[PDB]
């Protein structure tokens, strides 16, 4: 029941993802080094990770069918509000339930609860984030479903400041109808049972995680000593 327009969308989002997410993590060496000892010892490294990942999210987003047809202003608001969410989503790819960590190929670039808690953010964020990663992993999404969810999350009609919501909604619905049809045609049961409803629920989980991150960013940002450890892009995207 997948239309050729729908199959074209899947094709585009898979390539867009493949072009902006390097599964070998080679670029992690360009980051300020990780420090495992020290309350902000991991901040430099993870700030660089986040900042790098913001760029990659933008690159993926520009390739979303219809995104280009949005105003510059609407592209800005959507990316500013979705960045940390898509970072959490795309991170599920390296997250492993084996030891509850983000395993990016090597021990230097393998981040657990202890590491992630040495960057100025509290368990109020980290605990439900890890829970989120586990709950997302268990959905065992097809990569097709994975890239559709990231794109749907980015093109959300209800983000603060969106001007032409209806168009944003038109774009998202096409992605949504692609996701729902894909699940019907390509995802065998029981893995498919209620899967769309479950993925859309992860988008609600992400709002909650976004809100809490926003709170904790404001806190830490209020100490220039901490803001100094970030990057210009991170400062511009999460608030300046
Ligand atoms: C960022 C990514 C990766 C992992 C994600 C992680 C582990 C470290 C902490 C991250 C960045 C979380 C953020 C919110 C951090 C929470 C406290 O350390 C904040 C970092 C401070 C700049 C979200 C996803 C988490 C690795 C790979 O999957 C690529 C992906 O883009």
Non-local CB neighbours of 87 within 8 Å, separated by 6+ positions? 50, 53, 54, 57
The residue whose CA has the least distance to atom 26 of ligand 1 is 91
Which of 49, 74, 209 minimizes the C-alpha distance to 154?
74
The residue whose CA has the least distance to atom 29 of ligand 1 is 91
Tokens 């400062």, located at residue: 235
Q: Which domain holds residue 128?
A: 1-240
Cα–Cα dist 104/94, whole Å: 6
Our measurement of the distance from residue 198's CA atom to the centroid of its chain's CA atoms, rounded to an integer in Å, reads 17
> 170-206 burial, b if ≥16 CB within 10 A, otherwise e?
ebbebbbebbbbbbeeebeeeeeeebbeebeebeebb
Number of domains making up the chain: 1
Q: How many Cα atoms are found within 13 Å in the side-chain-facing hemisphere of 121?
A: 24
Three-state secondary structure call for residue 110: strand
Method in brief:
X-ray
Non-local CB neighbours of 70 within 8 Å, separated by 6+ positions? 78, 164, 167, 168, 171
Distance from the CA of 91 to the center of ligand 1, in angstroms?
A: 7
Please indicate if the annotation marks 159 as binding a ligand.
Answer: no
Cα–Cα dist 79/58, whole Å: 7
Resolution (A): 2.1
The residue whose CA has the least distance to atom 12 of ligand 1 is 88
Q: What is the CATH number of the domain that holds 103?
A: 1.10.565.10
């Amino acid at each position: 029941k997948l239309s050729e327009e729908q199959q074209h969308i899947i094709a585009i989002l898979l390539d867009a993802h493949h072009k902006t997410y390097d599964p070998t993590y080679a670029d992690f060496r360009d980051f300020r080094p990780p420090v495992r000892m020290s309350p902000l010892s991991m901040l430099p490294h993870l700030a660089d990770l986040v900042s790098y990942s913001i760029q990659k999210v933008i690159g993926f987003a520009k390739m979303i069918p219809g995104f280009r047809d949005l105003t510059s202003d609407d592209q800005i608001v959507l990316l500013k509000s979705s960045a940390i969410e898509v970072i959490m989503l795309r991170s599920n790819q390296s997250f492993t339930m084996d030891d509850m960590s983000w395993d990016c190929g090597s021990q230097d670039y393998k981040y657990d609860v202890t590491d992630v808690s040495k960057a100025g953010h509290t368990l109020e964020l980290i605990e439900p984030l890890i829970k989120f990663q586990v709950g997302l992993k268990k959905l065992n999404l097809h990569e097709e479903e994975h890239v559709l969810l990231m794109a749907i999350c980015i093109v959300s009609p209800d983000r603060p400041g969106v001007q032409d919501a209806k168009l944003v909604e038109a774009i998202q619905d096409r992605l949504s109808n692609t996701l729902q049809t894909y699940i019907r045609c390509r995802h065998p049961p029981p893995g498919s049972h209620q899967l769309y409803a479950k993925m859309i629920q992860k988008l609600a989980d992400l709002r909650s995680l976004n809100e809490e991150h926003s709170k904790q960013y404001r806190s830490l940002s209020f100490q220039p000593e901490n803001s100094m450890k970030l990057t210009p892009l991170v400062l511009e995207v999460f608030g300046n």
